[PDB]
Design a protein around this nucleic acid. Sequence first.
DNA 1: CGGGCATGCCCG
DNA 2: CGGGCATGCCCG
DNA 3: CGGGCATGCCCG
DNA 4: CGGGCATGCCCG
Lengths: 201, 199, 202, 199
Amino acid sequence: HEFIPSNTDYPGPHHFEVTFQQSSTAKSATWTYSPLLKKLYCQIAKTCPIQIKVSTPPPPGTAIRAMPVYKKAEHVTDVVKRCPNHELGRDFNEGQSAPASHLIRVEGNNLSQYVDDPVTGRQSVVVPYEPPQVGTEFTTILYNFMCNSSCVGGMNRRPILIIITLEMRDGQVLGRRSFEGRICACPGRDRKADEDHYREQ
Amino acid sequence: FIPSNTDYPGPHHFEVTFQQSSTAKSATWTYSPLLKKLYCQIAKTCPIQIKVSTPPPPGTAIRAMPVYKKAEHVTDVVKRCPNHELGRDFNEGQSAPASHLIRVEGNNLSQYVDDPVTGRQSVVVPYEPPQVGTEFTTILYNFMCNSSCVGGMNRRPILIIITLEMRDGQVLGRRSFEGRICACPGRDRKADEDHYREQ
Amino acid sequence: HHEFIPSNTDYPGPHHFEVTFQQSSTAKSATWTYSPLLKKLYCQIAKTCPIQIKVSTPPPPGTAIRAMPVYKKAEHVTDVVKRCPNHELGRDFNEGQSAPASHLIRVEGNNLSQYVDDPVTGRQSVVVPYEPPQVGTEFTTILYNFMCNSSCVGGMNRRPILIIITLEMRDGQVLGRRSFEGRICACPGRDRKADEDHYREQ
Amino acid sequence: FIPSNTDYPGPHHFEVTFQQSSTAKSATWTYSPLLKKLYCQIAKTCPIQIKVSTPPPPGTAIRAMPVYKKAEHVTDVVKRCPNHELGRDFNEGQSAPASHLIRVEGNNLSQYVDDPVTGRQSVVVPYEPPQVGTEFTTILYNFMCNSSCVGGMNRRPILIIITLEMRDGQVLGRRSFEGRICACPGRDRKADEDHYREQ
DNA sequence: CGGGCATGCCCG
DNA sequence: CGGGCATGCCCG
DNA sequence: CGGGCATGCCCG
DNA sequence: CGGGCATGCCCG
Ligand SMILES: [Zn+2]
Ligand SMILES: [Zn+2]
Ligand SMILES: [Zn+2]
Ligand SMILES: [Zn+2]
């Protein structure tokens, strides 16, 4: 209905929260998050796990929506899709049941549904919200990205921003958080450099 | 003829603002607080944030119209220099009037209006409430000739007036700010603020 | 069926075709100036620009001479040379109208000046008949007129152009051809002097 | 037939030549005599000078065929990567199959060829006599992908094989040269020669 | 008729 | 995202 | 317009 | 596992 995904955090009634645990001081590390720059550094198609949390059990049939947007205004109008070279390829499109075009995928959850909103044209994947696990503090949705931040054709070196939403069976918004995403060949280097430049300021 | 470039918040405190875009010679867009100056780059995306605390006239809408500052010119209309109006540069691909100066980018309900006997050009969008969690409705504008175009604004400054209205024309509010469309806002902003300050 | 990329290459034919330029103002704001060092004229939009034609032997009746512009740089070579959309319609010189304002090159005076618009190549030019040099005159003088400032947007913007003069037969042929960089601007002298210096640095 | 190559001047000595280019490192194109390698930026106009000794036959023409160098990749046909193919940028007029690497501009008589089952793509154009008072027949080519393109030439050196031939299949003109498509050609060129001199 | 500037654009 | 030139045009 | 950086991936 | 490299692109 709306073509400019709201970017602003807003926990809402319940206190929707997104956090990343595992850390890896390496360069070719599948994934690693930078708290100082609220930016996730993930590799191509590598298992990326984020952890959701809330204070009170949300309404029945709630959802978790993950959708990509561009950080800059000049680009934000353009739908974030998978580049031709990675779309038409066999690798990962061979019997996966997820639209070749989709950038973000959800790993290990049949209940996950990929969405192409017909008017907006935006793409996003959803899963029913889950109560953590009995002995855990958070809910672990584990995501995937199928294009580097620099894929000529798709992203094209443009910075994105993954937005995680706590939704109603109908769409009404109960929560939201966001952060910058940069898919690389190796997040060790990329992250350090960006935090060293931040330190350089 | 000659809309009222006169400020008026109205009933619902109307606040159109700008974010913190960086200062850089060739920055796509930048805004000055000392002056009400929007330094803009041709055809680039310029995000302008509109805040409204109590919004409730469904069918209400927001207009953006361009006007000349100096009085002798304010009676003249703000069109595009025939060079860009005729050129193939930004005119194909879009579904917006060849001659208007202002264009909305992230919206398709937009209305480019050519006043029948007024001759003023402006573009209206519907007022959409800010999305749950944030405070301002964000409209995306881009200007299609540089302020210095011969055949158009022959270097004469222009003011932009954003009016929120009732489905049937009735100005609930309005605001203004001078805008400049140049190759590099950063170097132009730096200079403008300097000369005015000195005096 | 025509030639796609008019060659600029000079051609002194059986007749000895030459294109000379008389003494010109070194004056900064000059109406027109020339450069044999940089072999390029510098003329003002819509100002009378003289040109000296010369030949050892005289050619047959019906023989005329063609002036056509073409971009100097290859990545621009294919674009035809027309006037900026602005000037082509601009009411400031289509009045006292005579020829299509598409055309950049016009001819002053001569009423035998018929323009061309090659349907095939969509190429624009202009042609007048070869009158033998005025009695006691070495040169057959044709006035060419240029309409857009080499820096006009929409039109040839800041993209150098070449002006090919062609000693052409009565019907489709080439007997002689000489070329030379054209540069339309506001300060012909300020420009030429700035150009030649820049050259006297290499 | 498939991977030809060996030069062959022929009846009318076929000579492929390049004019003097821009010394600049990021120029549209440059040719390296010592390295018999053409360096040009993607989609930029590359002029090539074709010459012959005697008025070649009647309805004869010229064709450009690109082939991978390494004796390994010869098998593989050389086309545009998926991205530059299904991408807007240069297919919005396309009197040229979006798949072809080599393209000709200016000429309307260009014909793009796809071999039957052993399909190789190429561009041909009727040969034309040098315009009166010139010795060079000039053809303006375009190279739609970068030799670095992942999914395309994927950094695989290639040869453009120019051949003069007669409609009746008789190929009696064969001149070939190395071709590299890249962002700034001067740089790679000087880098290519610098080291080969030393190594 | 030359000096000088503003602002687009390309390059020490 | 900074330094410096282009080149139409105004000044006087 | 050249010098420097960005960024997938080669190499050991 | 990281350091260094080529190659497209942006900063000054
Ligand atoms: Zn991709
Ligand atoms: Zn304009
Ligand atoms: Zn013009
Ligand atoms: Zn490619």
